[PDB]
Amino acid sequence: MLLKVKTVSNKVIQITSLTDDNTIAELKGKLEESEGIPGNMIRLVYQGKQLEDEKRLKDYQMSAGATFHMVVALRAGC
């Protein structure tokens, strides 16, 4: 339900309303769509674990798990 996502850019966001269909996929998809394009990897680590998209609804049973997003884009910027 409620999860705190923090990117490598020091962007922490605490929300109190998570879905049960995608949960993580919806959050990551909303961030990429908001900026228009994906940063690069857009991968977060849950409890030291990677890949949580498969745990969409499974993540809805948490409602109290810290999330950390990682985005590394050093390809080009001009």
UniProtKB/TrEMBL annotation:
InterPro entries: Ubiquitin-like_dom, Ubiquitin-like_domsf, Ubiquitin_dom, Ubiquitin_ubiquitin-like. Pfam families: ubiquitin (PF00240). One of its GO terms (cellular component) is cytoplasm. One of its GO terms (molecular function) is protein tag activity. PROSITE patterns: UBIQUITIN_2 (PS50053). Residues 1-77 form the Ubiquitin-like domain. GO terms for biological process: modification-dependent protein catabolic process; protein neddylation; regulation of proteolysis. Transmembrane segments: none annotated. SUPFAM superfamilies: Ubiquitin-like. PANTHER family: UBIQUITIN. This is Ubiquitin, putative. It comes from Trypanosoma brucei brucei (strain 927/4 GUTat10.1). The gene is Tb04.1H19.1090.
